[PDB]
């Protein structure tokens, strides 16, 4: 988060937003529950009642992850068809136009297509959280029936300490902590790993996407360079259009760069 | 008390008032109880009725230090509220003291979070005397039983001092008196010490959150010395505002300077 | 602020969180409002209703600013009421008992009019800070009757260019706009001069206020200190007490130190 110590939800502009004053706000942010519908909710609310106390809150968040997957696949197609829709409008338009307009639509095209690819890795991401969850969530009643016979060992020493049964429930209540403080380590143990191990696989596809998502940018804002936007003065006639084989070898380029492209090839530098 | 010996109800002025003459009277001393309203004085009240006679006025201490807190909390909550919406005015401003009153806004949420955790605190003192409340108003029926029954014991001597129950009774006040004289050494020694704990305590958070203060407010002038208070003549310009490293330096150390803050660190030293 | 990058409602813990874990949440926190009734609130929301709207704002904080002061001046009240009756308490107690909670009832006292005095100097800058809303709102109708001029003098123009009232209005615009423009400098002189006044006065009083009540404190526990918190075993006698003259010159030097603190031997360095 961006925010300076101060009270307001505002954040000092960055390099980006000193270059140039920020888009205003959104004209399409409707008043509603703020998500669409109620069928999700209904179904994260069901995840956050009926499952296990301590495994509730894993399996929340795995039922949002899967809503983002289903937004993200569902916004996916929505821009695949956009990208084809503006490709057809941009049919009928100059020749310049329709070439530059078709090979921005196969530009879009390969964007969703690699966001499908990063869809999937993300529903790879959330598959082992759900194994985390489910192994945690099995992990739990065993500090359940802990928890169970301590109570009642409290119980029946309160109404009759010399009741035979506190030997056999003391020997039970030290099984269930034998099978509990190590099954907690043996549950950090497998936290860590698969935490770990899954948003390592997840930021690994998130840097792959976005570096290609930039090259594609990169390749796109070259090729709308070829677009000539000069104006022609009224009843003039219109310039021949030759940029068939400079955007054939741009787009040709773009393609051998998207199969070159490799996790050690990404050129972004932490520091 | 700094009252001096005369009959007035002023005190002879100190270096501070010294200094300067004192400013007058707040003009929102309305006309009222006193107090605002009555359910609370009907708690106090009630608390000055019903309860036992030698714990009534310690259970009076604890409601009306209930109140206390209440009262701070909710003046807390307005203080937080004041600086919020104070830094919210400012906003609409010039944007050095768009600045200067949002870090001023900071600081006085600072304030409100620290009188928030010396409430907790004072919280606890008030638990505290709760506790010995307790304690002490269920040894009064000790002391209770034994005046009772040396009530009883005086007038069945009058009434038949040969009655058979003078005995038994004599027994029994001689073993209240045993259970009475060495349960009032007991409380007076649980009473010393869950005072002086409890006292200590509090005035260990007082003196934490006065230091605390202190600094906030030294840091806050320090940062005030920042703002441009020279006049721009009529017609002229507005010179460009370059105070936000410095600014953001201040409040990085006052931040920094909280966090280092130690009981050990106090440097007030009472002679 | 002292919240760290994460999503969490909770502070790193500093060197005095760090020293004893924080006390649990305060036991009186019930469920209203917040803020207890509803006539100030509606005090607040006419003042955010029907004052000129750039002054409406600081209209507003000032109202706040009298609600905080309010409740400030009663909570010192409270705390006055309950020293007095704490000692009150005190008073049938162990003759050392007695004196230190009679001891500790004056120094609650001293910090309760240190409090009073605090409120007077808080009401000062309150009153300055109406003095600052009155000037800047008296002159936004400077503005406003421009905005009605221009607005006034484009319809016009697009209902008649050629009509006759367009030279005069021209000339009463232009008029405006050398009242508003220098205006709006002044407004801006005067803001920063009368924030900054006001703010280093408050500030001022602040850290007075926390030194003196650091060094009640500190004086508070040092005489704590002289209270005997040894037990007595059961069925025991009383030992003597001898600590009239101790807490004697104990109070005697609070308050020539309370006399002698002025602005300049505040003990507090920022860094």
Not at 171 to 174: A, F, G, I, K, S
């Given at each position: 988060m961006h925010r300076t110590y101060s009270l307001r939800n505002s954040r000092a502009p960055t390099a980006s937003q000193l270059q140039n004053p920020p888009p205003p706000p959104s004209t399409?942010?409707?008043?509603?529950?703020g998500k669409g519908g109620l069928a999700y909710s209904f179904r994260r609310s069901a995840a956050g009642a009926f499952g296990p106390?301590?495994?509730?809150?894993?399996?929340?968040?795995?039922?949002?992850?899967?809503?983002?997957?289903?937004s993200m696949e569902l916004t996916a197609n929505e821009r695949r068809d956009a990208a084809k829709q503006l490709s057809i409008w941009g049919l009928e338009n100059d020749d310049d136009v329709s070439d530059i307009t078709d090979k921005l639509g196969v530009l879009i095209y390969e964007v969703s297509e690699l966001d499908d690819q990063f869809i999937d890795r993300y529903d790879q991401y959330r598959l082992t959280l759900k194994s985390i969850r489910d192994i945690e969530g099995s992990?739990?009643?065993?500090?359940?029936?802990?928890?169970?016979?301590?109570?009642?060992?409290?119980?029946?020493?309160?109404?009759?300490?010399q009741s035979p049964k506190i030997e056999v429930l003391e020997?039970?209540?030290?099984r269930a902590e034998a099978e509990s403080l190590v099954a907690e380590a043996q549950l950090s143990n497998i936290t860590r790993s698969k935490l770990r191990a899954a948003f390592n696989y997840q930021f690994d596809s998130i840097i792959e996407h976005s570096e290609k998502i930039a090259l594609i940018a990169g390749?796109?804002?070259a090729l709308l360079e070829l677009l000539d936007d000069s104006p022609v003065t009224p009843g003039e006639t219109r310039p021949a259009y030759d940029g068939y084989e400079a955007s054939k070898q741009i787009i040709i380029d773009a393609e051998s760069a998207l199969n070159e492209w490799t996790l050690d090839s990404a050129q972004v530098k932490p520091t």
């Open positions: 399409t942010k409707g008043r509603f529950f106390e301590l495994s509730r809150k894993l399996s929340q968040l795995v039922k949002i992850e899967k809503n983002v997957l289903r992990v739990q009643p065993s500090r359940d029936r802990k928890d169970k016979i301590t109570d009642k060992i409290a119980y029946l020493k309160y109404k009759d300490p020997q039970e209540l030290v390749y796109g804002k």
